[PDB]
Symmetry: C3
Subunit: 124 residues, 3 copies
């Protein structure tokens, strides 16, 4: 019933947490930053980090037995809401309608100096 | 199975998201800002925006077949914690006991220059 | 649906309940580093973070579970430089497998706290 997901197709945790926890058909995916999992280096710039975040989330979704289509809620933390338009473009490029529920805020800073962090909840 | 919730009585999404997603008895409501749902203009000042956020959430609750009494968790983002006392007053005016679980933080900024965003989870 | 309330954890400082349990899932309110006996914040980041874990653990137990049932934590810091000690406090208070997590630096927290942690359990 409860599984702790761990796949090296997504970035290793950079703190004391697991990549995702699945309970029943619900999955809680940790905040993902724009790391290339092979190097654990952030991509350069907001757009590349946001695209990488989606790759990272997708890899965890698949290791949890689902896909991005199973996301019901995303929580987005940006360090600059000037990036909101490109955020929305990256969402369109990676998702199909109907889109999940979402929240979005500008924070002061993010782990490892990322400029975008996205958390996810799935129902598979 | 997922059901996406939409109502013209709440603001249209200002980004790539749905107003809410329902899975069984659980509903994930997107962050709501203090927009008038017809004009998409923010109300003037914190109190009016907070009251409008509650009207927007209530509309989505009703579209999902529930009410504010079904909220189990609110997540509040403020741009000024000086508004905390009035936030708590607006909560009392709009809710009956038992109150939901909550978190509240001061963020750096919110989309479109709002001063309050509230996300909600229901169990109907 | 149960609204949890135990004075082993801090009283709510606003219009909310400590936690709500629905079925197997528990939503625990954001906790700050208050000593429940005095409703005063502990002094400094590390003491507040340790107290937050005591406060969350008390609510977990009042909800019929334990810290081992947490599936997700959401951490709000007022300074990213506290991230290293945050992770040390997590190791000291949790056993593997660790819950999922998110963490950000916010501008400020209620009552001048320097850390707030929200929790979701599955019991």
């Amino acid at each position: 019933t409860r599984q702790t997901i761990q796949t090296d197709k997504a970035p290793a945790a950079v703190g004391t947490y697991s990549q995702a926890v699945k309970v029943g058909n619900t999955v809680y995916i940790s905040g993902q930053l724009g790391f290339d999992p092979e190097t654990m280096e952030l991509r350069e710039g907001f757009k590349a980090q946001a695209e990488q975040v989606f790759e990272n989330i997708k890899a965890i979704c698949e290791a949890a037995g689902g896909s991005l289509n199973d996301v019901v809620k995303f929580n987005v933390s940006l360090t600059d809401l000037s990036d909101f338009a490109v955020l929305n473009e990256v969402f369109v490029a990676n998702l199909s309608e109907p889109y999940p529920a979402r929240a979005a805020v500008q924070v002061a800073a993010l782990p490892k100096g990322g400029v975008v962090e996205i958390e996810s909840i799935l129902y598979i």
